[PDB]
Amino acid sequence: MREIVHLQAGQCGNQIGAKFWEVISDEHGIDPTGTYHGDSDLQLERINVYYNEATGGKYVPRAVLVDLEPGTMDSVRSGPFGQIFRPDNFVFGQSGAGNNWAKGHYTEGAELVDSVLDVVRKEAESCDCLQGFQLTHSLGGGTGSGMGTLLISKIREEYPDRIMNTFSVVPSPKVSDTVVEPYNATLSVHQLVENTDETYCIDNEALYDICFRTLKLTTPTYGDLNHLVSATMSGVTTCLRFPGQLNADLRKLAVNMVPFPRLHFFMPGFAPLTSRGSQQYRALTVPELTQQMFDAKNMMAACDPRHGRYLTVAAVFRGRMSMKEVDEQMLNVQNKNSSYFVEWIPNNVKTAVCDIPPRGLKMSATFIGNSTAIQELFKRISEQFTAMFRRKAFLHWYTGEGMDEMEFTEAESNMNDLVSEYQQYQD
Template sequence: MPSRPSQVAGTCPALCWWIWSRAPWTLRSGPFGQIFRPDSFIFGQSGAGNNWARGHYTEGAELMESVMDVVRKEAESCDCLQGFQLTHSLGGGTGSGMGTLLLSKIREEYPDRITNTFSILPSPKVSDTVVEPYNATLSVHQLIENADETFCIDNEALYDICSRTLKLPTPTYGDLNHLVSATMSGVTTCLRFPGQLNADLRKLAVNMVPFPRLHFFMPGFAPLTSRGSQQYRFLTVAELAQQMSDAGNMMAACDPRHGRYLTAAAIFRGRMPMREVDEQMFNIQNKNSSYFADWLPHNVKTAVCDIPPRGLKMSATFIGNNTAIQELFKRVSEQFTAMFRRKAFLHWYTGEGMDEMEFTEAESNMNDLFLSIDSIRMPQPRRRRRRGLELSFSR
């Protein structure tokens, strides 16, 4: 979606598409249905059947020209197009297959614009289908090549937050989506409200992505509250700073203490003194200096927005580019490998025109990502000073 607000009051410059025809009516008849323009809804007559190949090559490909027409219309209405934001799931067929197809088309047509994705990775704890590892691995293969920034939101982490932190006995998709929406609102704060840090998508990428392939972020949020109880939760700046970077508050199921932060950003919302925020962030960096890459100076950025989120007086959102993100991908990769070695369920994909080589390429690309991360995690050897005669010449 275009990153600048639409000039038409009461409408949202967003594109919503489905291959399954019944899904959009659920949204349009709900409380948020009036936010989106009717001509921004695109849907087909049959589903992707949780099959990445159907979303990417057959059913999704048939709708792609209609989707791109709406994208072009939205892009033309922008005075200054920064880029596109895509929200999708990697476990099913439409969000993974058609979502990555749309991403590649946008990259092809708008190569100089930033592409930013909020990608929901699957988990056995909240699972709809057994082929989720296939769909997720094929999608990550595309995200590595075609996305500039990817915020990894993990169903396993969301489920753990709901059950352990919020003490919800049976978390629903509404509870999980509440956490996702709070995180997305915090991440996009600087895009929607006045501020100096990460004021557009490109500045965010420049601050957060030291290497092109390592653009996968783990977001965190504080305070964590269940739906309807936000008004009863109040934290100090020190507590917000401590909680937002805690492993239990991360929206990705990986422990940042198992890796190192290449870059990080913290966005505080609400009325609070900037000096106190800077002091707390300085204390956190000093206390956890071993978890930050020492060869990247000034790699933690902080911003404060006076406008708090709805229902809260203060909040904090954390964005971390941490090498521990590979734990999340390795969990998916191990499941992928176990199935692919036995060719399980592969006929559903080859029947849609895919080749086994595409699976091999996706697996290889993810393994290359692990190698790239490991090469950065390893401490750089100190260069030995050469012994011997040194000659200096002067005129």
């Protein structure tokens, strides 16, 4: 069959993969130790999409974790699920990274690309057919961009017929912690939009707004943030692993979503959130599902798409529903606002229906969307870049490493041209 090899990089990835994999395991009902116990015969059947079979009926994750700092490895091994990964799958360096994308893109990866490629293509040989890969990292990842750019560029020609989905967290507009972080973003995004097919973008400030708007829980953990994003990724991938009548495949989605080569970016958004009394006050119904489904409050990725226009929307529903209700739902929303949707395309709504519920809640859904509401992010980063660049701030590290200003010039050319691209389409 056709399956998936998962890549996780940077300390961002070190959180995300651990949380996301334990989520999937708790879904498909396997103990952290490994021995299975059958309750959903269908979940027993459809397992080769992610898990290769190890004797004793254990199901090794076809995932690979890479970073440069051993302590994060130690933590993700000492967590509640550390036994579930392979001593094989821990490739690593010895030196510290320090968020210097220049070194991360030449000075340490140059000697570990060999090992990482060996292991990943070993898994590729192990399996039969691959959709492609998905990568969990951060573009603001101080090691994330450095490793990701190189490995992506290699795997492009390694398997040029595949689906290399990218899942990244965007640096916070209000605060970047690292001051060379705008440099990291501007440098990574060039190769990103030069290579990618589908890339997600999620911001944590709006997650904190979620914390004070529906979470209402005082003191959240970055682990719980990871829990939210893991639920989103799970939901977008559920269509492949379960029965019920819907179209599942990733590029099945992609051809519908993207209009043109350089369009690659999307926003996720989740479905019913609920405060402590709203559990015993929420009537779980298709209308309110669709309502909050389309909420600027629920919007959490970049900013309110109020200010831009939706090119395309794709929605997945999960549970025991029918279709006439979702049909009347979108019909209602296009008729409520046909102005907001673009005219260059009619019928910009796409739907899918997976019958199998997640564990615990019956009615569920999730979103993916392409809107003209992302100018803000990279425009912001553009002014940040121009400001710090105005008189060669912090530039000596990179000029000692081996970079030079011309590279920065074409990166900023890429960014500004893309801005004009998005605009003059939506205009």
